[PDB]
Amino acid sequence: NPLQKARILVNQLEKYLDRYAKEYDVEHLAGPQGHLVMHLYKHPDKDMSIKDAEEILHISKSVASNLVKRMEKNGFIAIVPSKTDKRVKYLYLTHLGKQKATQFEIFLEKLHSTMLAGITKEEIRTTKKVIRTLAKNM
Amino acid sequence: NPLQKARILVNQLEKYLDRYAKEYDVEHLAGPQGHLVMHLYKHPDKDMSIKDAEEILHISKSVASNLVKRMEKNGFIAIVPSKTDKRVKYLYLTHLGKQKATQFEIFLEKLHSTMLAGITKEEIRTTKKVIRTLAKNMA
């Protein structure tokens, strides 16, 4: 049954991810914080406002604000408020965020090497398409 | 969390699945038995051996044999060994199985109408393949 197998896959997938994130020592960075840290490190000539994080992660301001607040508490970023507009805040990688970023690139590189073996990109775009239309149908 | 979200979706899909199988009274047919019944009902001029079932459902003789024995226990088919060949066993849709067929057709129509809207069958076949190969890769 496809639904029973998918339920099984999800559980294996969460276990598989926790195990690698530990092996690569990016366990707390795995997930949205990693996605933010990555974008920062990949685009050094741009600035990231908290609103940049909302649009990339399609989350709300309250959710994004507590996310960047978490990343600052973890020593991953410096939050620097804009001097012109008091409501705009910028995100900057610390030294630890830079090291963690570059380690996170390596961890993802192996995941795309292992988990997506034998899966073309056209198969992936459609799979994401099917899952979204199932979700919309619910 | 994307994984938390996928788990919730699959749980919604299964709940909606049970809802339609109850509605159309086809709960045991969701899956291979329904596929066999359909092949029987749709092709009434051919005969289906157990070895035919292996090819149709891409299963083993042992898996097909336990499948049809389950379908007979549910009264969907009669398994009648060949009167010519002692090694061939044939499958025949019963009266109950013919009613289940048309009940199963409307059920599939409802799935394609509601939960599986906008998803072609080729899109489903790839989705199943990605799921099989991702599971293989975490091993």
Author numbering:
A (entry chain B): 3 to 140
B (entry chain A): 3 to 141
Lines from the paper:
In the present study, we conducted structural and functional analyses of the heme-responsive sensor protein PefR (porphyrin-regulated efflux regulator) from the β-hemolytic bacterium Streptococcus agalactiae, which is the most common cause of life-threatening invasive bacterial infections (e.g., septicemia, pneumonia, and meningitis) during the neonatal period. Therefore, PefR promotes the expression of these heme efflux systems in S. agalactiae in response to the intracellular heme concentration, likely by binding heme. The monomer consists of six α-helices and two β-strands containing a winged helix-turn-helix (wHTH) motif.
Recombinant PefR was purified in its apo form. Gel filtration analyses showed that apo-PefR eluted as a single peak with an estimated molecular mass of ~35 kDa, indicating that PefR (ca. 17 kDa in monomer) exists as a homodimer in solution. We observed structural distortions by the N-terminal His tag by comparing the X-ray crystal structures of apo-PefR with and without the N-terminal His tag.
